[PDB]
Design a protein around this ligand. Structure first.
Ligand SMILES: [Zn+2]
Length: 233
């Protein structure tokens, strides 16, 4: 066919990051830790965003009110943030793709930007039409002693290597789906790979504190309550 897609029709599919708890209240969250140095990954709740370093483990937790159906699988796919880029597939760099896959005895070949750790049944699929890559795994019951489930993700490229992330921030969408292809719940988060995930998390927080000024509690109340004078030059 000469049309070779990318022309009039069919139009490329555009995934949406719209949250939808659904019946089982499917939610996503990332455990919090002190601002330690060389942190593999750190998350800020105020901004709903995660910073990670390449090849480091980022455990993520799913929270639901009642365990999903048996046979259900969890999906995770990377896509660009703005629509102008979400129609373009995210791929590997020329330098980092050239490296040998070393797939012998490995569950996650480098060919996929996102990989799973700690599940021998992790497998990857390719979108037949729009190229997108994604990885899937069977949902297991919540860990013993708590009500949530843990999945370990790994990234094989970093934001600033040309030909993959190419300085373009992206979003990751994680969904709970039934064996018959029906969606139960969808949640999404924003991801960045950087040299110091600890440093970027602190920086955005400092930007908010500067904008917000707190009133000292030395006095129970102001007698004059006058707003005279300049607040910010
Ligand atoms: Zn790369």
């Amino acid at each position: 066919g000469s049309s070779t897609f990318d022309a009039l029709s069919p139009s490329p599919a555009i995934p949406s990051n719209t949250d939808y708890p659904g019946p089982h209240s499917f939610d996503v969250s990332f455990q919090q830790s002190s601002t330690a140095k060389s942190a593999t990954w750190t998350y800020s709740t105020e901004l709903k965003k995660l910073y990670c370093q390449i090849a480091k483990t980022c455990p993520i937790q799913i929270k639901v009110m009642t365990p999903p159906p048996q046979g259900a699988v969890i999906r995770a796919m990377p896509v660009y943030k703005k629509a102008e880029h979400v129609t373009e597939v995210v791929k590997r760099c020329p330098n980092h793709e050239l490296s040998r896959e070393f797939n012998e005895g490995q569950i996650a070949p480098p060919s996929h930007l996102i990989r799973v750790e700690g599940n021998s049944h992790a497998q990857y699929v390719e979108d037949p039409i729009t190229g997108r890559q994604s990885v899937l795994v069977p949902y297991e019951p919540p860990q013993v002693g708590t009500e949530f489930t843990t999945v370990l993700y790994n990234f094989m490229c970093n934001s600033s290597c040309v030909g993959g992330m190419n300085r373009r921030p992206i979003l990751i969408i994680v969904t709970l789906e039934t064996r018959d292809g029906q969606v139960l719940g969808r949640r999404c988060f924003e991801a960045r790979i950087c040299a110091c995930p600890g440093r970027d998390r602190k920086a955005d927080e400092d930007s908010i504190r500067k904008q917000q000024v707190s009133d000292s509690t030395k006095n129970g109340d102001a007698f004059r309550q006058n707003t005279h004078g300049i607040q910010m030059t």
